[PDB]
């Protein structure tokens, strides 16, 4: 609070009232400290569940069916593309994995927007659409099918200037 000097610092080193949170928030344009806390809490929960299902005896059909259930569930979600290992879940599931599974990273991935923050702005303006329905919150993890089926909303100025640069406007579809 005052950038304490040497003797009062060695007297009171521990008092503080106010960094992977801000790290992924800056490199990955996440919204909230609590968004990171939720994702990290989630990852710790998953690791605890891995502990518990491993504590369940390995020669158990219940254990194997619930294990493969979690495996292909998180795969069809998208947080892991492999299905084979168990070390892939005990190690590779990250806040960065779920963060690249987040929507504006996928928009920036498919180059919908040049930048992830402009992707977020397009999300706020609703100039996008996710399969059947459009979207407005960036805090969205997209299933792989909707990742294949996400695009701009129709009759949007952004898609219209896409077709204007490509000189392929079709006003029949109010494109």
């Amino acid at each position: 609070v005052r950038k304490l000097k040497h003797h009062e610092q060695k007297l009171l080193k521990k008092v503080d009232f106010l960094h992977r949170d801000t790290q992924v928030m800056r490199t990955y344009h996440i919204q909230n400290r609590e968004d990171y806390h939720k994702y990290n809490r989630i990852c710790g929960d998953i690791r605890r569940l891995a502990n518990k299902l491993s504590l369940l005896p390995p020669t158990d059909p219940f254990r194997r069916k619930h294990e493969q259930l979690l495996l292909d569930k998180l795969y069809a979600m998208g947080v892991l593309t492999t299905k084979s290992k168990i070390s892939d879940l005990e190690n590779k599931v990250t806040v960065s994995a779920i963060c690249r599974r987040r929507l504006p990273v996928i928009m920036h991935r498919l180059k919908m927007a040049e930048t992830i923050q402009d992707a977020v702005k397009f999300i706020e303006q609703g100039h996008v659409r996710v399969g059947p329905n459009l979207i407005n919150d960036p805090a969205y993890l997209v299933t792989r099918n909707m990742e294949d089926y996400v695009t701009w909303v129709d009759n949007s100025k952004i898609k219209k200037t896409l077709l204007r640069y490509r000189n392929q406007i079709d006003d029949f579809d109010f494109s």
């Binding site: 989630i42 929960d45 998953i46 605890r48 569940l49 518990k52 299902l53 504590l55 369940l56 219940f62 619930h66 979690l70 569930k73 979600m77 996710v130 329905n133 979207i135 805090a139 969205y140 993890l141 997209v142 299933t143």
Partner: protein
Amino acid sequence: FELSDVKSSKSLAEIYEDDYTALSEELQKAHSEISELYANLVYKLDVLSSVHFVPKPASTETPTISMEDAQPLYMSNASSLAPQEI
């Protein structure tokens, strides 16, 4: 299985009364706890990946009544049985 080389918690009377009285209650409670945890985590993922509103799943002796019936509640068991299957 494997034995334990620590001191027995119970006496001879206690183990003998226990024997004198589900695979195991430990596996039962483990299945129960991991089921509630899986329910909550599937709920969290549905929250994070849902476009539409999803509330909490649920909240996790004595004579107790079961509201939802998986049957019309007035049909006999012999009536619901097929003659081939009897």
